[PDB]
Amino acid sequence: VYSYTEKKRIRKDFGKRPQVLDVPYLLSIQLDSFQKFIEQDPEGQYGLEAAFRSVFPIQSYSGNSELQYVSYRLGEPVFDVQECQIRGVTYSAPLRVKLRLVIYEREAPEGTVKDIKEQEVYMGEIPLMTDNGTFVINGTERVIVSQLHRSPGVFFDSDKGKTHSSGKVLYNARIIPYRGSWLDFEFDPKDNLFVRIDRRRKLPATIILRALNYTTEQILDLFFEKVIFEIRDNKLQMELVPERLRGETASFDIEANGKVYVEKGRRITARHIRQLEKDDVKLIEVPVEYIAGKVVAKDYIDESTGELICAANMELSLDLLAKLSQSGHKRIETLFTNDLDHGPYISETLRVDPTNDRLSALVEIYRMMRPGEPPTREAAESLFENLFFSEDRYDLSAVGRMKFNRSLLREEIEGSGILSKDDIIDVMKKLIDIRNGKGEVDDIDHLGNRRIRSVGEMAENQFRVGLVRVERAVKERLSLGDLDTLMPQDMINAKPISAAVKEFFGSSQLSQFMDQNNPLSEITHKRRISALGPGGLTRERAGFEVRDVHPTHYGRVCPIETPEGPNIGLINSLSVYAQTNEYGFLETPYRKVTDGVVTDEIHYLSAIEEGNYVIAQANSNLDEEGHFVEDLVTCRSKGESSLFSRDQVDYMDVSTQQVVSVGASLIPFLEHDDANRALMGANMQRQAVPTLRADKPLVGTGMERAVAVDSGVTAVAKRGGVVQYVDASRIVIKVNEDEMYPGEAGIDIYNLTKYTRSNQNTCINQMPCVSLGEPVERGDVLADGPSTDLGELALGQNMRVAFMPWNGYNFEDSILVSERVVQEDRFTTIHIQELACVSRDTKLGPEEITADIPNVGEAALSKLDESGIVYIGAEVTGGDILVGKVTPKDSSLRVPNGVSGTVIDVQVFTRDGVEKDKRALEIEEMQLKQAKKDLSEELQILEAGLFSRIRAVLVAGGVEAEKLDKLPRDRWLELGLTDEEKQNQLEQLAEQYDELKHEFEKKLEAKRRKITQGDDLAPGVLKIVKVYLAVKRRIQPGDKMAGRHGNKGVISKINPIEDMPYDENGTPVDIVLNPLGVPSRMNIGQILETHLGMAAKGIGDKINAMLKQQQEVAKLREFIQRAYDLGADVRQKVDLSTFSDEEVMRLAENLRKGMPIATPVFDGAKEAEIKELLKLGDLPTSGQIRLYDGRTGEQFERPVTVGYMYMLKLNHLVDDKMHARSTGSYSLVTQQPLGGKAQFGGQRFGEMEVWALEAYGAAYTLQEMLTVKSDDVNGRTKMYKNIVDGNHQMEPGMPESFNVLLKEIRSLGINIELED
Amino acid sequence: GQPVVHLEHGVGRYAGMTTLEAGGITGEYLMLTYANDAKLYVPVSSLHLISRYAGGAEENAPLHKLGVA
RNA sequence: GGAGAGGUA
C-alpha cells in the first residue's frame, strides 16, 4: 500500500476522520479557461469561433457584395519558451484566417453570385499559455488573477431609509446587460416611477412605455383591475367582487338579498365576507358618493356627437355621471385601487407624463440622450431601436438570460440575447409587487450574485472590440465602389487587433508581476481572486459591507487569508476544494446523505442551492455506517447553524480542511490561535526566502507533498522506470516495460534548470534526489527544487527554542540568537543581481566599450580583458568597473557601492549589420560548441535506447547473444526473424532510428541559425552587455525572521555559545523568545508546536542513539513500530513487518534527525496523545525542564519551557534598508534632494515633523533644515565652503521653490509680488 | 491539375469540382489554385471563361498571382 | 520627471 519511494520517510500522522476525497489539482482554474479560449469548437459557442461568427459576415450598404468568415488556424510558435525568456520577446502564435469575399451581380436580383474569391489573410499574434499557465511577454513572466464582478441580469435593490430623512424606503430595480446600456427604475418619495438610462437625467417610465407603441388604455389594462358600475333604474346597482373586501370599512349600508350585510362605520370582518359568499351575492346597490373621487379606466365618448365625454384616466364627478347617463352609457369601468394592496403608482406617473404619443416620446428621449442636435422623425427611432434591441450593441449573455428568467420565476433557462416588451413589463410588474410587499429585496454580497471571470472571457472581449474597428474599416471600404479588383488583404489591417490584444496583456490592471520567492508564493498568487479592476469597485471607495465575510463564503472562500491594510476583503483567496460552475459561480463538494446513511458519493453544490437543504458539518461522530452516534446534530441550515434531528439532514461536509486556503492549510494547531494572528502568520509564510539547503518541518499538516508536486519547481517522473544515468545537470530513465507505448519506445529524459535568477533576485536550481539503479514510479519526485526536501515543502529551519526573558535583549519582539545558527551556516541565502550597460548613439559620434579609459590607474583595469569586459568568475567588490565605456568627446559602468559578489554570466547583443568584437565572437563560438556537444550526447543516448529495445525484441525467436556482439550495432536491424508482427516492430524501430537521425541533423542547423543571427534592438542603442553578480547574504542583527503563528521579530544580537543557557545534559539552546508575547496576542499554537516538536526530536534522538552503537534491526523494527502506534484511533495503521529489513535501515537513517508528524488543521492531536508520545521518550511530561545560565552557571528556578520550532527568514534584509545620504544629486524643476534608494536620494522631512518641531521651541534648526539643507542654492554652496573652512554659519536667502510658485501664479492673470 | 486560363485573372491549375454555400444557395463550382494557393471558385454556369491552356507548356506553364570581387 | 500595479510599518 506504500510506494517504495514513499518508504524513505513516512510521516507519523494524527487525526481520525477518514479522508474520503483527495485534494484536486490546485492549478486547474486557468489552463481550462485558456484552453477553451483557443479551440476548434463546431458548436461555435466558445472563444474565437463565437466572436468570428458573431461579427461576421459583413454586408455592404447597397450591398452589392459581402465579406464572410470561413475558418481559422494558429501557426507554430516561432521560438520556444526559453528563447523568449532569453531575448525577452513574447511567446505568441500567428493567427491565420481564411476569409471569403463574395461579389453579387448588381443588376441581377437580390441574391446572386457574380464571382467569389478567398485567401488566408494573416492577422495578429496571440500570446500563448505556458504549461504552468503563466505568460511570457518580454521574458518578464507575469500572471493574471481572476475577477469577482457582479453578474449581469436583474436586481431588485432597496435603499434602507438612508435618504429624504422621511424613514421611507425607496425600492429600485436595475437591469445590467453583459454588453450594452444599463437600465434603472426608481420609486420617487412621491410614489412616482422613474426610468433612468446610464445614470443620465431622470425620466417618467410611462414615456418609455409609450416608446413600445403602447397607449394609455393598454397600459392601464396591463397594470390594474376593473370595477364595473351599471347605470340602471336605481342609481348604480354596482357589480362587486367579495375578494376586494379585505381591509376596508363599510362607509354606508351594504345591503342585498333584503339583508343588511353591514352598516356604515363598521370594519369589514372576515365573517362579513363569509356571509356574503355564502349568500353568493355579486351585485350591491351603492350610493353615488362611493364614486366621488374615482377615475375612469378608458375614455368614453358620446356615440352621436362622437365627442369624448371623459377621456381615460379622469376623475369622477356627478355632472360627469349625468353626461354618461344622458349618453346612454351602461357599463362604467374604473380602476380598482387601494392604499396597502394596489397603489395607483402608474396613474401618478401618467399624470406627470407630458407626452402622449410615440413620436414625441421618442423625440424627447433622443433629446435627453444627446443634448442639442434638433432631432428628426428618424433619428429618435433609429437611436432607440439600435440601442435596446439591436443584438450587436446590446447583449445579455446566456448567463444573463438564465439569471433573468430565474429571478422572474420563468421556466426556460435559455432565451434571446436582447430584450422584449414583455421583459420590461414583467420587470416593472415585479418592482410594483415588491413595493406592495410581496417578494423581497436582494442583497449583493451573496455569493449567489457575484461571478468569477478568468482570463479567457476578457481576452475574447478584447479581441472582439479590436475586431470592431477593422469591421468598420472594411464596411466603409465596401460601401465604396471599385470592387472589381479588391482582395481580402488590403482592407484587412493587423495593427488594430495586435494593438488591442497586446495593450491588454502587456499593460492591464490584472496582468501583474509574479511573486516567485517560494513555491507557495507562486501557488497562492495564482489562485488569487481579486475584486478590483475594470468593471470592479475601487480600492479607496469601498464600504465595510464589501470587506465583511458574507455567510455564504463558507467553504468557497478562505476567510482567514487576506492582505491586511489598505485593501482587505478585496484580494480574497480561493478555498481548497472549491470548483467553478459551468457558468462561473463557485461550487463546493458535499457527501450525499441518504435516509440514514452517509454515502461516499459527492455532489458539487452552488451557493444558491445550499440555502435550501440542511448540511451537517465535517466533525460529526458517525460509526462506520453514517449512523451518527449523536441525535441533535449541528447543521448549517440556511445562513445559520442549529441542532437538528438525526434524520432530517441531507448532506455532510467532505473534510475538516475544506474551509481554508492552501496557504493557511500549512499552519499546525490552527484551531487554537486567534484569527488575525493566523492571518498574519499566513501572509508572512508567503514571504519566506529559500535557504541554502532546505530542512523538512518536523511538524507538518500533511498538505506538503500536494503543494510541492502541484507546483512546477520539482521534476516529477511521468512514467515509472529505472534510473539509467544521473548527473547534476540531467537525468535519464529507462521506461518500465508496460508503460512503454507499442511504437517509438525511446526512454525518458529530463534536463535541470541550474542557477537562474528568480523574479526576486533569488537564485533557483534543482538537485537530483536519487542514485543509479533506483527504481522509480509514475508521479514520483526526482529533482528537488528550491526550499523542498524529498518532494515535500520545506521553507525554513527547525531550531531549539526556549521561552524566557534574557537581559532585555528580547524586550519587545527582539529575538536573541546563538552563534551556532551562523557557524553551522544554516540560514545563508544566495542572491543574483543583473546589471546592464548600453552603447547609445549620440552626437559627437557614438561611444564604445574599449578597454582603455583616461585618468585611471592600471589597478582597476587589471580585472578587465583586452576587449573591455571583465572575465567570468571574477570576484568584484563595491565600486569597481565591469565594462569600460567612454565619453565621446567616461561612462564606464561600475559596481553599486557596498555590494560584493562574483560574476557568473556575461551576455552581449548587437544591432544587425554591425561588426562584432573579440569577446562576442568567443562567446558565440562557445555556445556553438555547447549546443553541438549537447545534441550529440542526446542523440547517442537515444540511439542507445533504441538499440537496447531492438536487442530486447530479438531475445525471443532467434536470439543469438553471440551474434549480437559479433557484428556491432551498425548491422542489427537487418537480421532475419520468424515472420510475424515482430518484423513489423523491427521495421518500425529502424524507421524511428532514421527519423531520429534526420531530426537531429536539421535541429542542429536550426540552433545554428538561432545563435548566429543578429539581435533586434530599440532605436539608438548599438549594443547591450549584461552581467550577473552572485552574493550570499548570511545574517546580521536587524534581519527579520519569524515563526508560523504570526509571532514575527527582529534578530538583535549574536551571543557566543558559551553565554547561552544550557540544560544539565550539555546541549545549549539556540533561540530565546520573549514569553510576554503570548498572553496578549492569544496564539497558543506556537507553545503546542514547541511541545510536540520537542517530543519528535526526542524520538529521533533515541533512534540515533540506538543506531550509534550498532543495533540490529530486531530492536529498530520493534521501537519504530511502537512509535507509529499509540494513536487515538488514528487512521495511519502502518506495519513494519512488511518491510524489506533494509528499507528499515534507510528509514531509520532518515529519521535520526527526528520523526516527522502530521496534523490536519481541525483534526489536531489533543493534549493527552502529546503527553503519551513524550512519555515514550524519557522527557518530562510537564514539558518544562530546568536550565542553567551561561555566564553565572547557576540554575534558573521556575522550570522553563523549551522545545523545537520551525522558523522562516523573511525577505526584508537589513542590508537592503540601511541607507544614508550627506550631499548628492538635485531634482531639476525644484532644487531639492532626490528621493529613493535607487538614486542617492535623501529622506523627506514631512509636514507632521514640521509641526512637531514647531511644538518644541526649536526654531533655528527648522529654518536651516528647510532653507539651507534642501533648497537655497547659494546658501548650500556657501554652507559647503563654510563647513570645509571650519566655520558653522549659514546665510538663509530665499527658497527657489517659492519663486517657482510665484512665477507659476503670475502665469495666470494674477499679478502677485513682494512689497518694499 | 490541368492548367487553365481564365481571362479575368490569369493562369491557374484545375483542382476539381466542389459545392459551396453562398448565403443560403448551394452551388457547384470549379476550383482553381492560383499562385500562393489562392483558391478561386468559378460557378459551373460560368464555364465559358474557363479556357484550356494554349502555350504548349502544360507542365511548364506559369502560375499568376491571383489579384566577382 | 510623470502615470499604473504590487508590497512593509
Side-chain angles (χ1 to χ4, degrees), chain A residues 1-42 44-109 111-163 165-1316, chain B residues 1-20 22-57 59-69:
Chain A
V1 62
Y2 269 91
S3 160
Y4 170 92
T5 48
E6 209 174 13
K7 293 169 177 174
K8 288 204 185 68
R9 176 169 67 208
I10 48 176
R11 185 173 294 276
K12 174 59 175 62
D13 188 13
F14 294 115
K16 299 88 190 178
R17 311 302 175 194
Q19 61 180 18
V20 65
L21 167 53
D22 57 2
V23 293
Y25 186 56
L26 310 180
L27 303 170
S28 68
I29 55 134
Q30 254 305 94
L31 308 180
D32 196 332
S33 171
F34 189 86
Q35 176 56 41
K36 285 189 182 172
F37 173 59
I38 43 168
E39 255 304 330
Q40 304 301 342
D41 173 49
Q45 51 174 338
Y46 279 138
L48 293 171
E49 191 59 23
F52 281 156
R53 208 172 297 178
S54 178
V55 63
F56 290 110
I58 297 162
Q59 294 163 359
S60 186
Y61 284 4
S62 356
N64 52 25
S65 57
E66 63 169 10
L67 170 58
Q68 60 192 45
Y69 163 87
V70 173
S71 181
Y72 81 104
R73 172 185 64 86
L74 293 181
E76 189 65 13
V78 300
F79 305 144
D80 85 301
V81 169
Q82 279 70 22
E83 192 67 2
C84 289
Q85 296 172 320
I86 292 159
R87 271 89 74 89
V89 293
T90 301
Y91 164 64
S92 75
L95 168 55
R96 313 260 174 176
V97 44
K98 304 174 61 52
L99 296 182
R100 179 179 299 176
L101 169 56
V102 307
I103 298 172
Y104 308 158
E105 171 44 36
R106 302 173 295 95
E107 284 77 21
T112 183
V113 178
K114 167 166 173 290
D115 296 315
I116 174 168
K117 59 178 74 67
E118 69 182 13
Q119 64 183 165
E120 188 180 19
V121 57
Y122 171 96
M123 62 189 304
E125 267 187 359
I126 49 179
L128 290 185
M129 176 165 286
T130 60
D131 181 13
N132 307 349
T134 73
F135 307 149
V136 188
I137 303 305
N138 307 322
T140 56
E141 54 186 340
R142 317 186 181 185
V143 62
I144 293 172
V145 302
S146 299
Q147 198 174 85
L148 190 69
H149 60 68
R150 67 199 304 183
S151 67
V154 68
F155 302 104
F156 310 98
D157 181 284
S158 67
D159 72 317
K160 47 182 60 48
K162 206 50 50 196
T163 304
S165 184
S166 50
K168 174 176 157 57
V169 297
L170 302 92
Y171 308 147
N172 70 322
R174 176 177 298 92
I175 304 178
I176 318 180
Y178 180 55
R179 176 170 52 89
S181 299
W182 302 25
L183 194 62
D184 306 319
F185 298 75
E186 305 174 5
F187 259 88
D188 201 283
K190 301 205 75 180
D191 299 356
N192 293 343
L193 211 64
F194 285 108
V195 162
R196 183 190 296 258
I197 309 181
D198 287 19
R199 303 306 313 196
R200 295 205 189 283
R201 193 171 73 266
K202 204 166 63 173
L203 279 179
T206 63
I207 297 165
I208 211 174
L209 275 297
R210 301 196 191 289
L212 315 189
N213 211 33
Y214 281 157
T215 66
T216 63
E217 70 279 348
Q218 300 166 18
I219 288 167
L220 301 185
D221 193 326
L222 290 165
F223 280 74
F224 289 115
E225 292 298 343
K226 338 299 157 201
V227 168
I228 316 305
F229 284 83
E230 295 70 33
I231 289 166
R232 296 183 60 84
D233 55 345
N234 307 335
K235 305 307 303 185
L236 315 173
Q237 163 46 268
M238 180 217 66
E239 170 54 32
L240 172 144
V241 162
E243 287 64 51
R244 304 190 171 108
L245 281 293
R246 292 118 186 78
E248 290 82 0
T249 182
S251 64
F252 57 87
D253 190 331
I254 290 72
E255 180 284 323
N257 289 354
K259 191 281 196 185
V260 171
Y261 289 102
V262 64
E263 55 279 355
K264 55 180 55 46
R266 287 294 218 76
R267 74 98 172 186
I268 308 307
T269 63
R271 68 180 310 92
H272 290 164
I273 298 86
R274 298 296 153 287
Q275 58 181 8
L276 171 54
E277 62 200 283
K278 288 157 182 48
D279 291 322
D280 299 303
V281 179
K282 301 151 293 310
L283 288 88
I284 174 59
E285 169 44 36
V286 52
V288 69
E289 315 314 327
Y290 186 69
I291 321 187
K294 312 297 292 187
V295 297
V296 65
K298 73 162 56 180
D299 70 315
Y300 282 168
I301 71 179
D302 200 84
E303 55 80 19
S304 69
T305 74
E307 305 161 7
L308 72 96
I309 310 306
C310 321
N313 180 24
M314 172 52 210
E315 284 67 42
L316 269 287
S317 161
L318 287 297
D319 58 337
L320 280 301
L321 178 154
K323 294 148 208 161
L324 314 194
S325 54
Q326 71 187 9
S327 296
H329 305 152
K330 295 291 100 170
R331 303 290 145 274
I332 304 92
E333 53 174 56
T334 183
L335 294 303
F336 171 43
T337 68
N338 209 353
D339 296 1
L340 73 171
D341 184 16
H342 307 310
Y345 305 101
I346 285 294
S347 77
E348 270 63 34
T349 312
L350 286 169
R351 297 183 212 291
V352 176
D353 197 339
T355 305
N356 56 17
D357 67 297
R358 179 159 173 258
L359 175 51
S360 165
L362 274 70
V363 163
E364 81 80 14
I365 287 285
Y366 180 98
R367 296 196 306 94
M368 185 218 65
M369 281 302 308
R370 292 194 159 181
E373 312 96 10
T376 80
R377 201 195 175 286
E378 279 50 53
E381 56 185 6
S382 52
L383 177 67
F384 175 84
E385 182 57 32
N386 85 68
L387 178 64
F388 265 97
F389 307 92
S390 283
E391 49 75 23
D392 71 329
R393 297 180 63 78
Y394 181 88
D395 177 12
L396 277 56
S397 276
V399 177
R401 172 58 59 173
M402 187 281 289
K403 261 281 288 190
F404 196 79
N405 293 338
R406 175 55 44 72
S407 187
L408 298 193
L409 312 172
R410 294 277 196 73
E411 294 296 347
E412 308 88 9
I413 61 182
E414 190 280 341
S416 304
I418 62 185
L419 298 177
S420 299
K421 303 188 290 291
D422 60 333
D423 310 353
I424 307 180
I425 291 169
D426 308 328
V427 166
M428 302 178 66
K429 263 186 168 62
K430 185 63 180 301
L431 177 58
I432 290 171
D433 168 285
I434 280 175
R435 177 52 179 75
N436 294 329
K438 290 91 169 182
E440 313 309 328
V441 66
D442 336 311
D443 75 317
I444 197 68
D445 304 342
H446 205 254
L447 258 292
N449 309 337
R450 315 168 70 179
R451 202 176 59 86
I452 289 288
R453 185 170 59 183
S454 52
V455 62
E457 184 169 25
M458 300 179 292
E460 177 165 17
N461 291 112
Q462 297 309 135
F463 189 73
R464 175 189 284 281
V465 66
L467 257 183
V468 168
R469 300 183 180 174
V470 303
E471 182 276 349
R472 185 162 63 176
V474 59
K475 209 168 199 173
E476 55 77 13
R477 181 67 199 90
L478 291 183
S479 65
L480 263 295
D482 175 69
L483 58 88
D484 53 4
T485 184
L486 264 299
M487 285 299 302
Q489 170 51 240
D490 49 8
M491 58 187 59
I492 297 290
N493 188 13
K495 301 305 212 74
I497 313 306
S498 167
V501 169
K502 182 55 52 49
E503 61 87 7
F504 157 64
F505 279 142
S507 299
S508 168
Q509 297 159 24
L510 303 175
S511 59
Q512 57 184 359
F513 216 89
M514 176 170 70
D515 312 337
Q516 207 178 16
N517 58 11
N518 266 325
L520 174 58
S521 174
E522 302 179 27
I523 287 295
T524 186
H525 198 293
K526 293 168 184 185
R527 301 178 62 91
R528 199 77 90 178
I529 306 302
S530 172
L532 318 183
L537 52 94
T538 302
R539 143 181 306 93
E540 52 177 0
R541 294 196 206 159
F544 284 95
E545 317 325 313
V546 174
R547 301 193 154 85
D548 305 314
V549 300
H550 196 266
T552 319
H553 289 65
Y554 182 86
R556 299 184 187 77
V557 169
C558 176
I560 68 179
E561 208 301 322
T562 290
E564 59 178 343
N567 55 347
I568 318 184
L570 314 184
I571 314 302
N572 314 331
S573 173
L574 207 70
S575 78
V576 168
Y577 294 85
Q579 283 186 344
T580 307
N581 207 336
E582 195 177 3
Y583 305 122
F585 303 99
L586 281 159
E587 301 197 46
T588 166
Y590 286 114
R591 310 173 61 173
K592 174 54 176 53
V593 174
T594 59
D595 50 343
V597 194
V598 169
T599 62
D600 60 357
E601 51 162 353
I602 69 190
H603 303 334
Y604 279 97
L605 280 57
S606 170
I608 306 169
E609 304 161 358
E610 173 173 309
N612 313 344
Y613 307 88
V614 41
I615 306 91
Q617 69 178 0
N619 54 11
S620 304
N621 309 320
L622 60 97
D623 49 13
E624 188 268 327
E625 298 174 352
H627 301 353
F628 300 165
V629 175
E630 313 94 332
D631 300 352
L632 283 297
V633 196
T634 312
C635 311
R636 303 178 299 90
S637 84
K638 42 178 297 309
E640 55 84 5
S641 66
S642 175
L643 298 72
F644 295 161
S645 61
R646 187 158 112 182
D647 65 349
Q648 204 164 1
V649 296
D650 297 59
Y651 288 97
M652 184 169 189
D653 306 1
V654 180
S655 302
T656 69
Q657 64 193 20
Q658 69 178 16
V659 178
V660 296
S661 82
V662 55
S665 173
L666 317 186
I667 306 181
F669 303 151
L670 169 56
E671 71 267 64
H672 300 302
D673 302 19
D674 193 27
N676 48 14
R677 273 292 175 190
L679 169 154
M680 295 169 175
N683 276 3
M684 299 195 308
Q685 195 179 45
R686 278 176 33 249
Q687 309 178 6
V689 167
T691 58
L692 189 50
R693 61 186 201 273
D695 186 342
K696 79 199 168 294
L698 268 172
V699 276
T701 72
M703 198 74 87
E704 288 77 19
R705 292 187 178 81
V707 175
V709 303
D710 300 331
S711 178
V713 277
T714 63
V716 53
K718 311 183 295 306
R719 313 203 297 274
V722 169
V723 173
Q724 182 141 323
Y725 154 88
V726 62
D727 196 21
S729 68
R730 81 184 63 186
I731 296 174
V732 290
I733 300 289
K734 171 160 186 305
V735 182
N736 283 336
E737 174 49 35
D738 312 335
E739 302 170 344
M740 188 183 299
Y741 290 164
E744 182 66 352
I747 63 187
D748 204 283
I749 181 170
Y750 300 101
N751 297 318
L752 305 180
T753 63
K754 304 313 304 177
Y755 305 95
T756 55
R757 79 187 299 278
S758 60
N759 277 333
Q760 319 312 139
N761 315 343
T762 82
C763 75
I764 77 187
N765 68 330
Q766 298 151 336
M767 294 161 291
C769 64
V770 287
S771 180
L772 282 161
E774 280 208 24
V776 306
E777 284 64 37
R778 170 157 169 279
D780 184 281
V781 70
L782 274 160
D784 296 344
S787 62
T788 51
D789 173 16
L790 293 163
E792 51 171 18
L793 196 71
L795 306 99
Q797 298 296 343
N798 44 25
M799 292 167 288
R800 169 169 279 263
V801 167
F803 285 86
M804 71 187 301
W806 200 92
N807 307 153
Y809 272 106
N810 61 3
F811 168 77
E812 196 69 1
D813 294 312
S814 297
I815 294 167
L816 174 54
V817 172
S818 185
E819 194 177 355
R820 297 290 277 275
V821 174
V822 50
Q823 280 173 356
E824 297 159 339
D825 189 323
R826 62 192 314 178
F827 268 109
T828 53
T829 65
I830 303 179
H831 297 252
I832 291 170
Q833 301 193 59
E834 161 168 340
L835 303 179
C837 182
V838 316
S839 59
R840 299 287 181 177
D841 196 353
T842 178
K843 287 70 58 175
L844 292 71
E847 66 287 344
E848 47 279 356
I849 53 175
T850 178
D852 188 5
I853 40 156
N855 47 266
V856 287
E858 59 77 24
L861 316 187
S862 305
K863 290 160 173 171
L864 277 65
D865 84 321
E866 52 76 32
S867 182
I869 302 93
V870 72
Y871 309 91
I872 284 174
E875 305 170 355
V876 310
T877 66
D880 205 1
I881 296 79
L882 308 179
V883 289
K885 200 168 76 73
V886 292
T887 170
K889 252 185 72 174
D890 188 317
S891 183
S892 67
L893 173 62
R894 292 188 170 176
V895 169
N897 298 15
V899 313
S900 180
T902 66
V903 174
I904 70 182
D905 187 332
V906 179
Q907 296 170 341
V908 288
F909 322 103
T910 58
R911 296 196 89 106
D912 302 3
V914 176
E915 78 191 18
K916 291 141 67 169
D917 62 358
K918 193 175 302 315
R919 180 66 100 90
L921 304 167
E922 196 292 324
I923 288 173
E924 174 185 321
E925 182 282 338
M926 176 170 175
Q927 279 182 304
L928 257 292
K929 167 172 288 186
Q930 178 52 35
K932 171 59 175 300
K933 181 257 188 173
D934 186 317
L935 295 184
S936 171
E937 178 69 44
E938 167 274 345
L939 172 65
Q940 63 180 359
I941 288 295
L942 264 73
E943 184 177 3
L946 267 185
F947 284 140
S948 177
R949 182 78 198 293
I950 290 176
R951 183 161 191 165
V953 66
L954 285 175
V955 305
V959 65
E960 298 79 31
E962 57 282 341
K963 301 300 303 307
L964 311 180
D965 54 61
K966 293 294 166 294
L967 204 61
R969 63 189 71 266
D970 65 328
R971 190 251 160 279
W972 280 20
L973 58 155
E974 308 100 320
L975 270 166
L977 162 69
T978 186
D979 305 68
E980 51 173 358
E981 56 76 27
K982 294 197 168 194
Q983 221 67 28
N984 185 7
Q985 264 189 311
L986 265 295
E987 299 294 351
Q988 213 290 339
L989 297 185
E991 172 55 22
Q992 292 296 321
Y993 161 83
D994 280 335
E995 185 280 342
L996 263 299
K997 280 289 295 183
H998 293 108
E999 167 275 343
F1000 152 86
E1001 99 199 3
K1002 60 176 61 53
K1003 201 169 191 175
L1004 174 56
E1005 168 50 26
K1007 263 188 180 176
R1008 266 185 174 178
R1009 292 243 56 83
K1010 263 193 168 179
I1011 287 174
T1012 187
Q1013 56 150 322
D1015 317 322
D1016 60 352
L1017 286 177
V1021 290
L1022 290 174
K1023 54 161 64 179
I1024 288 174
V1025 55
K1026 295 180 171 186
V1027 298
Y1028 288 178
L1029 274 74
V1031 201
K1032 301 178 65 175
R1033 310 214 163 287
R1034 170 167 62 267
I1035 211 159
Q1036 292 89 345
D1039 300 356
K1040 177 176 178 181
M1041 76 200 312
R1044 275 185 294 182
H1045 298 287
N1047 51 10
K1048 61 195 160 187
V1050 171
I1051 173 161
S1052 167
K1053 205 200 179 198
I1054 312 298
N1055 284 341
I1057 53 175
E1058 44 266 16
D1059 301 355
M1060 273 288 144
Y1062 72 101
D1063 64 346
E1064 66 280 339
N1065 193 13
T1067 69
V1069 305
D1070 307 347
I1071 293 176
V1072 178
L1073 298 179
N1074 181 6
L1076 301 180
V1078 167
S1080 162
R1081 46 179 99 91
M1082 299 155 286
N1083 49 7
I1084 311 307
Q1086 56 182 311
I1087 286 167
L1088 281 170
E1089 171 185 353
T1090 306
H1091 290 7
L1092 176 52
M1094 191 183 178
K1097 180 52 174 296
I1099 297 303
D1101 180 16
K1102 263 192 71 176
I1103 288 173
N1104 169 31
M1106 292 174 62
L1107 257 178
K1108 188 52 56 189
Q1109 66 202 22
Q1110 278 57 44
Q1111 200 66 247
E1112 67 285 326
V1113 299
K1115 301 298 184 63
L1116 273 297
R1117 199 184 293 272
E1118 155 51 60
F1119 186 67
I1120 297 168
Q1121 176 59 40
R1122 188 172 72 245
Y1124 279 107
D1125 307 346
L1126 65 58
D1129 323 327
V1130 293
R1131 54 151 188 282
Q1132 183 69 281
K1133 187 169 55 49
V1134 52
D1135 166 289
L1136 268 297
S1137 69
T1138 177
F1139 282 78
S1140 326
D1141 188 88
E1142 279 55 44
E1143 319 325 315
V1144 173
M1145 281 297 306
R1146 200 171 62 204
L1147 183 60
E1149 287 295 348
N1150 292 15
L1151 295 194
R1152 70 189 290 158
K1153 282 87 78 178
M1155 186 176 197
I1157 304 178
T1159 310
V1161 296
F1162 285 116
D1163 194 353
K1166 301 172 288 186
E1167 195 71 3
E1169 43 261 64
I1170 280 175
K1171 299 292 190 63
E1172 304 142 32
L1173 175 53
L1174 279 166
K1175 191 158 55 50
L1176 190 63
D1178 309 339
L1179 310 81
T1181 183
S1182 308
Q1184 312 197 329
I1185 83 190
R1186 52 158 49 176
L1187 273 182
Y1188 299 81
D1189 193 306
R1191 293 84 53 74
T1192 66
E1194 74 194 354
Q1195 165 167 357
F1196 300 89
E1197 77 299 72
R1198 184 66 56 75
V1200 67
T1201 295
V1202 312
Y1204 277 63
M1205 175 176 288
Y1206 197 77
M1207 310 211 70
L1208 314 310
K1209 181 161 88 66
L1210 293 168
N1211 188 29
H1212 292 58
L1213 289 299
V1214 66
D1215 188 9
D1216 309 353
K1217 316 298 178 57
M1218 182 270 275
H1219 158 68
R1221 177 255 186 79
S1222 64
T1223 306
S1225 80
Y1226 278 99
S1227 159
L1228 185 62
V1229 60
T1230 165
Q1231 300 307 332
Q1232 298 183 12
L1234 277 181
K1237 194 199 198 309
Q1239 311 90 1
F1240 199 55
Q1243 304 305 276
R1244 162 163 188 73
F1245 191 70
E1247 169 177 27
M1248 302 176 115
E1249 293 80 16
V1250 169
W1251 299 344
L1253 263 179
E1254 294 159 276
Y1256 295 138
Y1260 274 113
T1261 181
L1262 170 63
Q1263 175 264 13
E1264 102 180 3
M1265 192 164 292
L1266 54 70
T1267 194
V1268 72
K1269 286 171 62 182
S1270 66
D1271 204 315
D1272 192 315
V1273 53
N1274 308 120
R1276 51 184 159 98
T1277 58
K1278 257 184 283 189
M1279 185 61 183
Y1280 200 64
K1281 279 175 167 54
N1282 266 314
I1283 291 285
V1284 169
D1285 308 350
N1287 174 12
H1288 304 100
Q1289 197 173 357
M1290 61 85 68
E1291 316 314 322
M1294 161 168 288
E1296 165 50 24
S1297 304
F1298 180 80
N1299 298 346
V1300 170
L1301 169 58
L1302 199 68
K1303 292 294 194 309
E1304 177 169 314
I1305 287 173
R1306 201 177 302 193
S1307 189
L1308 289 67
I1310 319 306
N1311 170 28
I1312 180 171
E1313 54 272 82
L1314 314 186
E1315 308 300 62
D1316 58 356
Chain B
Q2 177 184 352
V4 165
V5 304
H6 190 285
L7 68 171
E8 185 63 11
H9 312 102
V11 181
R13 311 297 176 162
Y14 174 70
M17 172 179 176
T18 320
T19 177
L20 281 77
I25 54 182
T26 300
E28 296 306 330
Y29 297 76
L30 300 158
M31 63 187 308
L32 285 67
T33 72
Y34 279 71
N36 301 112
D37 191 358
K39 299 299 185 69
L40 178 59
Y41 303 91
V42 182
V44 294
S45 305
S46 179
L47 176 57
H48 44 82
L49 304 96
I50 297 168
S51 292
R52 288 60 160 170
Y53 189 55
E59 316 315 322
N60 308 319
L63 196 65
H64 282 110
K65 62 189 180 179
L66 186 52
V68 292

